[PDB]
Amino acid sequence: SARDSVGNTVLHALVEVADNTVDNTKFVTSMYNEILILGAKLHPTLKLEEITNRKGLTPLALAASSGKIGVLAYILQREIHEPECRHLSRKFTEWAYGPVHSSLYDLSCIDTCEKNSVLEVIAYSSSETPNRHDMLLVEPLNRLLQDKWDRFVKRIFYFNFFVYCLYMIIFTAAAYYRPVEGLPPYKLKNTVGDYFRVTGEILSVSGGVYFFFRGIQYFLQRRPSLKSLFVDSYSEILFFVQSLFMLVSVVLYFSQRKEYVASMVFSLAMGWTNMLYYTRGFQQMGIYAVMIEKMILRDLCRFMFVYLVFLFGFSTAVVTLIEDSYNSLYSTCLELFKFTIGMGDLEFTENYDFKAVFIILLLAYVILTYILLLNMLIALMGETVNKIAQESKNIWKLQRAITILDTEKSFLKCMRKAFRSGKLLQVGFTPDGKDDYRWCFRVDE
Amino acid sequence: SARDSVGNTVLHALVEVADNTVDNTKFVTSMYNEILILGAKLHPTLKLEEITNRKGLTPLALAASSGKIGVLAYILQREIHEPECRHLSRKFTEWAYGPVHSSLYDLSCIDTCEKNSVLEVIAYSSSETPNRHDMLLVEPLNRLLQDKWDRFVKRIFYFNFFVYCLYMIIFTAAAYYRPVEGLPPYKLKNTVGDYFRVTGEILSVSGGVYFFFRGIQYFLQRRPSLKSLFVDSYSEILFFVQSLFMLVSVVLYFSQRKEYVASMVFSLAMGWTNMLYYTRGFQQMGIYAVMIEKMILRDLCRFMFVYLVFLFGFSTAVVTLIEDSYNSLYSTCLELFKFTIGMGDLEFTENYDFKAVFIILLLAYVILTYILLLNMLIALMGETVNKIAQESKNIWKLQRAITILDTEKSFLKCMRKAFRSGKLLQVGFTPDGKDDYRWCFRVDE
Amino acid sequence: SARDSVGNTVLHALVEVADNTVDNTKFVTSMYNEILILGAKLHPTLKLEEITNRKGLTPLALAASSGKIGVLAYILQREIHEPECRHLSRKFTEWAYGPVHSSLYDLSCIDTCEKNSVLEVIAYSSSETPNRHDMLLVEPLNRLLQDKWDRFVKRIFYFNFFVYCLYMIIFTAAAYYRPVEGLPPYKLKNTVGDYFRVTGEILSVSGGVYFFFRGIQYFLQRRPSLKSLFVDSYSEILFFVQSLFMLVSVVLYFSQRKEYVASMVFSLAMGWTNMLYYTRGFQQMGIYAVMIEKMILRDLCRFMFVYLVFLFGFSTAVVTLIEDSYNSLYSTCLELFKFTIGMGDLEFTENYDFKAVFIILLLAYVILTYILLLNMLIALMGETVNKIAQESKNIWKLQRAITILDTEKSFLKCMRKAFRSGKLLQVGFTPDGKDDYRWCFRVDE
Amino acid sequence: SARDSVGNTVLHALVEVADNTVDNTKFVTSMYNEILILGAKLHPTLKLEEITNRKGLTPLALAASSGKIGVLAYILQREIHEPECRHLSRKFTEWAYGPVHSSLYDLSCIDTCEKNSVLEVIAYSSSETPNRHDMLLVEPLNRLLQDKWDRFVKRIFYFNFFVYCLYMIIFTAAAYYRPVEGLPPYKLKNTVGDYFRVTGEILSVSGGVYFFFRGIQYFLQRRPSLKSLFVDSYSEILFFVQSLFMLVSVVLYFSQRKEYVASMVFSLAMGWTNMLYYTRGFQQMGIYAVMIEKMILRDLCRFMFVYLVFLFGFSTAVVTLIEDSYNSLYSTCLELFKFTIGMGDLEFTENYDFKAVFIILLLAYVILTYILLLNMLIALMGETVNKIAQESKNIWKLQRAITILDTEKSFLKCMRKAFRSGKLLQVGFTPDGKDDYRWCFRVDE
Ligand SMILES: C=C(C)[C@]12C[C@@H](C)[C@@]34O[C@](Cc5ccccc5)(O[C@@H]1[C@@H]3C=C(COC(=O)Cc1ccc(O)c(OC)c1)C[C@]1(O)C(=O)C(C)=C[C@@H]41)O2
Ligand SMILES: C=C(C)[C@]12C[C@@H](C)[C@@]34O[C@](Cc5ccccc5)(O[C@@H]1[C@@H]3C=C(COC(=O)Cc1ccc(O)c(OC)c1)C[C@]1(O)C(=O)C(C)=C[C@@H]41)O2
Ligand SMILES: C=C(C)[C@]12C[C@@H](C)[C@@]34O[C@](Cc5ccccc5)(O[C@@H]1[C@@H]3C=C(COC(=O)Cc1ccc(O)c(OC)c1)C[C@]1(O)C(=O)C(C)=C[C@@H]41)O2
């Protein structure tokens, strides 16, 4: 039961030295196996893998968190059937048929840990985990998540998506049929239309408060950092910001400001786009939402900086050039923006001098932006998509895993009765003269 | 002549265990050689391949249907020239020249089977068959398809395409010169122009009925399932829907509804587009038609969901924002759609408050859809084509095979004289003192 | 001097059996060595390589023509320095330094053959020649083409390009300042402007006649076939068609038809775009002209068929739908075309019924063409360009070779004094007691 | 201390014969190591590496300049610990831990050489250097660049970028609020607004003069040639051109010309665009600036030639065709340009005859340019990016290196206190009884 200065034991050290190469994988797995067996023989009373570091991470949890696929895949699929060693086996084989094995896996601290489980550390990783997307392909995790999806989570997720659709329809109806008199709040009339509208407004604000508190719960439970605040937590941030716009709309509504509409429409717009959160977790249709997240966070910042540099530079040049209607910098910025959307006039004003200078500026602007910068954006998108589609293919599973964990955490029964299988003695051997059962889960493959 | 619970013999089991890898192919090949020789020696009177499974599939038909290209390539190119074994040979070599062999192939259950032939099961596969595109490159099948194409089917196909062109020209003329009086049906006038118009309408409806019954015949013969209804049968579904629009147009025409025009134009719009069906089967020009069938079935659903989520979200936000002409959600949806086609005004109304909110909403919509989502679609399509052009290169041949089989099934002569080859005694050895001929087919290659 | 049943020599058989694979290349090389040595020993009086096949091609010319790059590379780089074998060597080494060799090559039947040379057959190939792009990288051919380029051809080519630019400027000026009175021809006034205009017209027609006769000379010398008329001869066809439009313009001008303008502008348009012919042969800028040729001949036919099917189908549907401006099929075709160029109105007429049907037709047309068909075009172009840029990189050199051969064939001095090198005795050994000189060409590489 | 016929030492010859292949790397490395040791044994008093070639380049500086990455990596990472040989080692190992080494590097002639340092030659290369992108990843150079970045250069660079932002804001404000009276210069009024305006103008011209003299200093220090003037020096050329426009604006302003505005706006349009120079050196956002540089220098020339050939040809054809408002060639050129930006009318005039000819010309122009040429540009850009993204990844670091060297060279303190580390005796052994210290630099890696 040795420990290091950080508080971790030797098995954590074996995890850390991993780098997921073939020879490193062989070395680390062999050292893990041998040291664990030796620890069993010297101290059969005390298990090493139960020992956490100062961060409360077991070697399995550290291997999962740090993105070590060789180590995690070894540990989760570690079958030990030797004398005085079976009692630390992670999995077993009941039926040893040729094409198919009826393996049984111990799910201790993989679903329920009460500190942090393998699924929890994988799904709630910091996004720096190099193999988190492929880490769930490890047999017990893949089959466990698929089982939990089909068992109860699929229905709950579809119900939540349906309810969100109802919420957005109600919100859209309540906002669309908003009153057009001045100075809110608006007195209710006894007509049924006002009762339906105010019910819609109340449900809209109720959903806003729900998402607001859900966002707070997420941020408090996760405590993310600014450096990775948007790289992770993107969907939760968008839902939280939607709720923020809803609540600012409520404040302005009861503060007697027309500007409540200014907030409400944004929330409404955000609300509909937030339906893409529910498309993630579908392999067929979730690709676009993941790519939108990735491109907005990664690619849109640099492109928009360059594009705005071009647009502002040429807009300032043009608005300087003209003199007298379009003399504002805003109008010129909009006119130069129109070229991007294929609606630039290319002679939008005569009130100026030096025709050649003006047309040269506009031609250079459209060549640089419309013909060149946009096509360069397309080229970079083509390259990066060609590289990352294979990653999005697994971001599917990763988001489904997050969904499963969130559903288990809520669960709406005030209980954690979400276990799958196991009612009989599992191991058949202990260092003592007893037997143990640790939530055996069967995988036929 | 052992059998299993489904009724299938050991050869079907040898097919099922295949996975088209090199070592597996060698294993199944060797097992086939051993079991066939044993069948010859123990039961020369009993054929193994004639045995069908529960679904009426022979081992050859199962190998073809299940997409086991290695096993099928072995079986169709199986040359046996050993004592007391030649009688099970599938092919022979008459001329053993250096660069070229005059191979001779058996066509039993290749074109005529009376249950289901190799060409029938390959062509009418469920599209999940992993090797359907490349499976027809197996030498006897490729040569059979090319031979039957050049011999009879090429002329018949071009005639059918020409007749369909005549049908669409007649339909276009009859619809274009429709009368403009009220309340159909319209009385035939004695002028020759109206005689031609009514003849064109009659031929148009006649072709509609023809395609309607052809669609019914297809659905009854194939019995497609909902899960694979569109990935297979796409062209037949489109022709059937065209005919459905034509027949609804006829009903509305004789039901005294102007709305018949609404159906007729759709059928017309479908009919010309359905000419792309005839474009498939030409290696050069078919590439778009195939791609269209793919891009609609795979890419359009998800893209249109995301695009409509963005469009509806920002459209309902904008229509909420404006107040007073454009106040309907439909008009705002169209105005925001116009940005996609490069015709968005970006100031299409002044009737609102909070100009900053309105322009921010429109700019965000433009960036999310026009710049990001459309270019993302382009990126994904580029990646997809980069991956799938090599498969389209052969789905050309697959569609030509479907054309050949349909032409043979119709054949319009009240006969089944559609065999490919064979006029000479073939085998040279039987376990009895006789000889056999089984439609010998020559391949000089 | 062995021959086959057709009368071609065994060397021609060795060329024909080649397939440019490594083992085949080694086999044919060894057979060439053996047969050439045997020819030297048995019949030193008569050389094998001089004997032509039935088509009048030598084995070197056949190897070049048929695209057997390994055989040609072997032959042209064949150094033989053995007893009683030097006299048939193709090349030598004067300075055998480590990093560099001063190789010396025989140019027999490389530039001057009087039947067909290696450069002539490579440059004037059928475009199916698999290695024509890389075949000119064989050391003596690449060095000779570069030598001819730098020596005299580059100046002549740039002079011709400059003169063509002058011709097009003159043609543009003469056409731009055409008279606007009725019923040509136009009587000259004594003003200087008319004299300059008629001089420009005379030079324009003179250039037209020049290009007409050059096209005829090309077609007579090459005798291209319809199946490969455009895959080769594309630039010459375009120049010929330009000249045809010019001559039709002349006929209409003197036939008292205003329609001469209709022809002239087409020639003028072609006359400018044909400058891209001179762009080929420059590595930096010749990429676009090559790709325009390739895409028009390969990709534009099928894309335009599919696009016109969509456009015509939906245009006919829409023009059927509307009733009463825009009621012609031409106007509707133009309005639907405008969507492709980002200028579709999407409500271009109110004179119709069934708003939903009309807008559904237009939206479906937009999605099918503007969003899908154009993006599928882009995807296919991306794929094919990713595959063929490496071939364009060398068709640069191929077009330069064609330019060099054309310049030699003209040469503008009434002579053929276009030899590259050699003024000294070359071989040093003959089967007789003499010595020979065969245009030695030196390469320091 | 032997030399060759050029006067360069044997080590320069060893550098020249390198080609960065593995076997060549071993060959040259072994010969270099052995000859250096032999030089130590025979002439320990005189070092070989310090000796320059005719161009003033040491073998290290030549290896860096000529792009021989293997030789440079070996030399910079050359450790010798043998008797009478360790005194010429380039680096040492202080701590020989397993996963990490505390290497110690000698920086002689890496930052300061007084003829040519490694950083100077790499950063100020001619852009033909094949390995300049990856050459800075050699351990001591990468660590030096990162150290100098974090130590003092990062703050100085961000300060300069901030000051340039302030300069452009001041320039934009001064130009935007230019007076609108006639005939400059404009008399200064005593109102505060005009004092701020004239202060902004003075600061704008001051910055222009600063950038003018900085450009002159760059061109004098580098003395670039026309053939590589733009592939290198691109940013410096753009800053110089901005300053030239500013100074021409000053001359016209004091020359009593309104046309000063024509220059000033260009400088303004230049200046904002030149902010992209500062995006290089940030990995995330510097990709677009590098891509735009490469695109403009490589692809834009050929694309614009082909595009302008098409545009001018069809504009001349159309302007010839029309007759009577659009009759100028400029107006027709603009109308045909509008198709490129998605705003072509396709019936912009009726003043012609032969509508079919006019529309055919415009449709052909659209298909050739809008559909084919632009999408061809997209395809080529996609392929280009696919190949060159890996180059841009390191061009980031290369431009950061240029920034570091420029900051050290200017440094604005009248001092050169920009050394990294080293205050103790370094070598520990010399052929004499002495010891030496040469700016020992530590790398823990
Ligand atoms: C906090 C992030 C960074 C974000 C929040 C708002 C402001 C947002 O602008 C962005 C920045 C932006 C602004 C304008 C155009 C593009 C991007 O992108 C998102 C954010 C961008 C989106 C588009 O991305 C999505 O919401 C789709 C989505 C994909 C995957 C998901 O997991 C998801 O979870 C909800 C949502 C939609 C907006 O919320 C929206 O509808 C409005 C009016 C602006 C978009 O900021
Ligand atoms: C049943 C399928 C799914 C389909 C039937 C109709 C409604 C269709 O809309 C689609 C959905 C759609 C609607 C609007 C835009 C794009 C797609 O696509 C096809 C279908 C889509 C097509 C485009 O695809 C093709 O038919 C070309 C084609 C390619 C390959 C083939 O083998 C083929 O066989 C006929 C046809 C044309 C339409 O029939 C048409 O002309 C109209 C007005 C709508 C198109 O539904
Ligand atoms: C004979 C060929 C096939 C061709 C001849 C004419 C009709 C042409 O239309 C085409 C078909 C066409 C029509 C409309 C749009 C695109 C293509 O393409 C070329 C041909 C297409 C071209 C574009 O291709 C080029 O001429 C550039 C070029 C590239 C490489 C070359 O080696 C070259 O040699 C001259 C020319 C320009 C036109 O001649 C032109 O300017 C007009 C008015 C129509 C074009 O027919």
Ligand SMILES: C=C(C)[C@]12C[C@@H](C)[C@@]34O[C@](Cc5ccccc5)(O[C@@H]1[C@@H]3C=C(COC(=O)Cc1ccc(O)c(OC)c1)C[C@]1(O)C(=O)C(C)=C[C@@H]41)O2
């Ligand atoms: C000397 C070069 C070749 C150049 C100088 C001027 C004329 C320039 O036109 C170009 C040619 C040109 C003209 C019109 C459209 C595109 C390109 O490109 C640049 C040059 C092109 C650019 C766009 O490229 C950039 O300057 C961004 C940039 C990227 C990377 C950098 O390291 C950088 O350093 C400042 C700048 C902007 C202009 O200076 C500009 O704002 C105007 C009005 C024309 C552009 O000439």
